[PDB]
Amino acid sequence: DLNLRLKKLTHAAPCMLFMKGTPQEPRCGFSKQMVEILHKHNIQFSSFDIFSDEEVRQGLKAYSSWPTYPQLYVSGELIGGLDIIKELEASEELDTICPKAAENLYFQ
């Protein structure tokens, strides 16, 4: 069941990015810009490569009624794409909306 599958994928991590390629090898400038912003802000995120699975690539566009990528999800909710992530960065609310990892030490 595809809807169940897409619910699970969008909720796979506190912050989930659907992109062309991976964060280390982004395969589109729009995806590259997205990952750069997230990395710069030290956002904690997992990602899914839409080139890896065409059923997910097309199904998620219909499921979320969002006709392109990249798409950022936080807590399973669609935040949006590149333009929205830039606006949040610009208004300084990106860091508030998104999760970040603990930076505690593993030594005393």
* Residue in this structure with the two tokens 């798409």, named with its chain if needed: 71
Cα–Cα distance measured from residue 71 to residue 59, given in angstroms and rounded to the nearest whole number: 13
Cα–Cα distance measured from residue 16 to residue 80, given in angstroms and rounded to the nearest whole number: 11
Return the number of other C-beta atoms located less than 10 Å from residue 49's C-beta: 19
Q: Could you tell me if 62 and 45 are in contact, meaning their C-beta atoms sit under 8 angstroms apart? A: no
What CATH number belongs to 5-101? 3.40.30.10
Residues near 70 by Cβ (< 8 Å), separated by ≥ 6?
A: 17, 18, 19, 20, 30, 31, 34, 81, 82
Provide the residue ranges of all domains of the chain, joining segments of one domain with +: 5-101
User: What number of CA atoms fall less than 13 Å from residue 35's CA on the CB side?
Assistant: 20
Which residue numbers belong to the known binding site?
28
Lookup: tokens for 82: 């590149």
Lookup: tokens for 58: 């097309």
Cα–Cα distance measured from residue 20 to residue 31, given in angstroms and rounded to the nearest whole number: 6
Which residue numbers belong to the known binding site for [2Fe-2S] cluster?
28
Q: Could you tell me if 76 and 10 are in contact, meaning their C-beta atoms sit under 8 angstroms apart? A: yes
Cα–Cα distance measured from residue 102 to residue 1, given in angstroms and rounded to the nearest whole number: 35
